[PDB]
Amino acid sequence: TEEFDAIKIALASPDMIRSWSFGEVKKPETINYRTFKPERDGLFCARIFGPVKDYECLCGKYKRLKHRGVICEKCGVEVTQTKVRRERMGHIELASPTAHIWFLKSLPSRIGLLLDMPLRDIERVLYFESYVVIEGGMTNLERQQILTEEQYLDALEEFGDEFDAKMGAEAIQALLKSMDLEQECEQLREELNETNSETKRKKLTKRIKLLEAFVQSGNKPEWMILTVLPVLPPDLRPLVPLDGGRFATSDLNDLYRRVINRNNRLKRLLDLAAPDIIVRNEKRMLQEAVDALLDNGRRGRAITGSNKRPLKSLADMIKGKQGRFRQNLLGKRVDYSGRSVITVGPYLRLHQCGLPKKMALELFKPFIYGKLELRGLATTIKAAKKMVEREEAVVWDILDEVIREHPVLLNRAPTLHRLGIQAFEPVLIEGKAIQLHPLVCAAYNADFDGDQMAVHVPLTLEAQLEARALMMSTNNILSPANGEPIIVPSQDVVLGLYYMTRDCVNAKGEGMVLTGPKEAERLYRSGLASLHARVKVRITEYEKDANGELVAKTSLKDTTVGRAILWMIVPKGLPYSIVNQALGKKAISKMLNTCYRILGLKPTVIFADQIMYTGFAYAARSGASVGIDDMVIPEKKHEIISEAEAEVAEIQEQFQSGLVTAGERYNKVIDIWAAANDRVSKAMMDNLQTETVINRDGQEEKQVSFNSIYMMADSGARGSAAQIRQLAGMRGLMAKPDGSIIETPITANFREGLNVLQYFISTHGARKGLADTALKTANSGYLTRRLVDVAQDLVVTEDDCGTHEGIMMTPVIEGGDVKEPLRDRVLGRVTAEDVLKPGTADILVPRNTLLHEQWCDLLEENSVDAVKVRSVVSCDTDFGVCAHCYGRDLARGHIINKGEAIGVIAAQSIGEPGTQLTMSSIQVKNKGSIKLSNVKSVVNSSGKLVITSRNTELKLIDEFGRTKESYKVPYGAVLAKGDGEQVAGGETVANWDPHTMPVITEVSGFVRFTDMIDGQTITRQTDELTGLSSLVVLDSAERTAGGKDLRPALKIVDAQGNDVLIPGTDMPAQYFLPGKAIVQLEDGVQISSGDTLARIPQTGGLPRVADLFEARRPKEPAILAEISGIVSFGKETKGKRRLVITPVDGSDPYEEMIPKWRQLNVFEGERVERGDVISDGPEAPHDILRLRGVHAVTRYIVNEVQDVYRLQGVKINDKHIEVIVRQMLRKATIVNAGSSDFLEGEQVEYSRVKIANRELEANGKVGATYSRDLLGITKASLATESFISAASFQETTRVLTEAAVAGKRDELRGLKENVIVGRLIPAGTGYAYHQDRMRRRAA
DNA sequence: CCGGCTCGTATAATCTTATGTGAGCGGATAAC
DNA sequence: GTTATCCGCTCACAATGCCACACGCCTAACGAGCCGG
RNA sequence: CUUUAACAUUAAGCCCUGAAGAAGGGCAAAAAUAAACCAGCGUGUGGC
């Protein structure tokens, strides 16, 4: 029907089924097919469902339209349309009751969770193997106690009429309604208030939440068991018309026939007083038959004749890649469409495409019919059909009137990102292929290798106007993933423009003088002066530094004839120094980009067209071919290979004498072949790039070459140094598929021949790369599918949330070069707070403005290192994202409008380039200030600097204050310098030992042995070839039971032998000793201030991004600190080693367990702040969230995923990854109960908690306390309020079972739901629809 | 002169190169 | 002893899109049919 | 015994609307439900 709100779901009562149906099927036969009338009371019928033909009795009595409503008596068939055959249900009244298969085997077992009874027991009740007891009463036995035949017989001896024990589905049906619901809830609530054990509280909170949701619905525990089973309207499972004889049956019809045969046989056996064994067996057969009908997968049994495939049950018509969500309710086939192969056609403009004439007559047939019947050239529709099937000459003029302003959508099939479908205007072509403008071809990522494209037609008025405004190809220049133009001129235009704008030192007409650029053109056409000969010309140029107008300026510049020709298509704005250089690929790309920045939109489009036209024209007049004498072999290749063979023979002889081992032999050979390959490549590149010597009109000079493939590489059209390296120099080192890299490299190039073995070796890398591509495609597609499932319901919905939180951005520095500066990251995001000038108390930026480009430069000039800026993850708006929390939009210019469905474009921007992926001393480098962060150090006796703080960090600074470089300075290392010591570059400023942990002291004196007994705790090991016998101290577990209860310790004393206190505190720090602690300076030996007491020895591709957005737990994570306090070890081997951290003021209830196998960092007297590392390794983000706050997990995810995308040169803006992070941490647990109705262990979406706390804080009550969860993206999709949006995604079965038990109700808000139903989307245009509806509802 | 043959048709049965997850449940396992 | 945990076994559920093309989708024995021997 | 005998027909309701004994209904009770005539899905291959 129409005008309906939210969809409601619940269980279905038997009386509801009798309210549905229109008759009772009794006979299992479909049709007689002697005559093809349907059999009465079969699966097909006419009295039950409806008329076979239109408006006719099956008897054939009433055949007139004016007899509607009155049924026949010859056939009992209501004279109605055959659409009624699509819509009337049927019912079957079963003999025995029957268990539903989903509620038994969803696995959370709904019956088993409800009755508190294990699943296997209920299974061997339902399949007739046991008994249950139903109100035994004055009986030894209990209720849920189950038996066998022997205990049942012995009970019949004992309590022969007391207990009531049944079996089969009737017994479970008896147990279900015998149970109350209120008493179980109140009893188990009192029991949960009388329980402290955790797992019992888990199970009981599950059971009472099940019961409370089950009572707050409408339904009952009787309804999980079927009694009356409904059947589908028989047009919806149609009988296949074959050719000759019989009709081919579907799967549903065979399953219903089997069920009805079994039901009739059981009903007759009940009619004749059958013995008990046979009716038990028959009820088991009927239960198994209904379990085969509803879902064939739990018992994979029903297979048909001549095709041993599982038949398609009703649940198989919903799941999978062919059920009604993925197949038919999202991707529908569409009329007015078409398909062809494509073809270039370089004469087009940017906003049009080539359309075949005949196919365009075929598409627009109704518009043609309307134009013909308008102009009087026809009267009926059949006259118009005859005229357009004759293809008379008036029809082509009519078709050209139909085209003129009516755009057409074009599409390429594996659509990744939102530039995949675009709208053009048509230009008619007598042909059979679709022409397509060549600049757009990079955006589609189209070949011309046979790639096919498709055509759709917008046909209403709003669709034409949207395809003109929102989607015409003159409106998509910048990319939504990053603000870069997608209209880069490709390979051939690059070659043309690079060949035009060069120079050579002696040509025709060199050094003459010219008037305009057009006289240089007239000299090029006549053949008087060549295309590139240097010449002084006169140029006028316009500069718009005047505030909104143009300033002329005329001068004489030393330039080239080709550059003067190219200047004629540059518009008024740009300065002449944009076309004075050699103009490769990136140069003309930034030419287009600066033309977009300074002038606007329309000169950018028309300038890209003029560039494409003249680039193809002069690429034609070049004649740049390629030939076998354009690949210059070096003259020095032969002796380099000879010297490499001499060196490998010498290393082979040094291995043969036995001096060098095999691994170092391997390493020397691979190093010298790497060096030889690099030398040959250097020689060939130096021989190609500059060999061209030409006569000056003096003697000789040098210049950049005019060789063919060097122009094809130096312009950046096709190829790199690597491909042109393999063509003439030798090719690399081929690696075998085991993972090793082979000894002998391929000594030959491609211009010479390869022999048999070397080609056979190269085949390995070929097939490896091909298989990698073949699997990488599918994995990227699946990950894109899941991300756009997650982020779909999120729309920029209001203007200004108006908060004062956010994040702090600093330009990222690994320690090598600064990877991303502050300009590129925080271009175009709205400032959180007023970042002050380095001139203090001077407002450099207002707190609530937008960092546009000029403003970004004026922020850059004062060398700001950290800017605070508003993110999406802290935006305040319920059910959406505020506008100023998201900033300016990519692919357009200004701030984002209210409605842009940013979650979908974000998921596409992450998931689009997924195909391109794959599947001992600190040394400063420049001069600046030396800053050490979290440093607490002391100079020892030997002048070295040992640090008593773990978290020391190195910052190389300039004179300004911005960070030049950064490194990590370990705890207590060998430091060549101190803090703030102004040093210069190239300096190794630090060192340490990777096999010695610092057990450094704090005072001077002696070190004495407390509980360090040789034979109990410590051992005396003599280094047998040096002479310094030392002591080795283990931990408690590695030594035996003689020192297991003992704790060895190096007690820090003075030279007298007494504990000198730490300067600042009053605590003696005796040093208890961990394992592998080699104590060198023993008792009686004087120590220093912080001296080494004990020496202690110790992915990346696409699945990294997959395992990160799943947020799955890494192996052996890093233990953090829960709250600050003094560390204290405790009891050993109660599973693990205990640890108690005592706060300064609060108590210490948490006594954390640590596997003593894994190592540790902190010491006993040491105390650390919360969230700090204990055992090194990977980290799960759960801990990062619950300890370091909310922004920390966003920064961790952004930096890691952005490292994986910076490794391949892929540039993706950060706000997309932020708005994917927001949809991951939306659920929440509750810590208290609060003052409202929320339970404690209640998982609940955060925004409802936030509006509940806002409503309670409006009054004077107390709120609730919540811990923000963090789920995987598939777990976040699969737990959503809309039960449609979780049904369309994977595991539809479990979602429909849980949603049908709970009886939910889906508001239809979001994108995916309204696509399913088929009204306007609440995202784009139609957003302005929905709130216009919403104010209609509330008022 | 009913079904022996011959046909219309309704309906029952002895794999064996996969991976990675999560999620749950039965059996051991370390304490007052 | 008995109780609250830890761990190994078993099992459901996912794995891009589109295109063309092409050939496939029962029968030994239980209720009727013909009429010969 | 004086010139052919025979007048029959007892059974189906009550109430409302309606110009009526013109007609339209409900309730106490029940056997029995030709024609003149507008006009698919499951395997394989290949491509991107």
Ligand SMILES: [Mg+2]
């Ligand atoms: Mg291609």
Ligand SMILES: [Zn+2]
């Ligand atoms: Zn009829």
Ligand SMILES: [Zn+2]
């Ligand atoms: Zn906000």
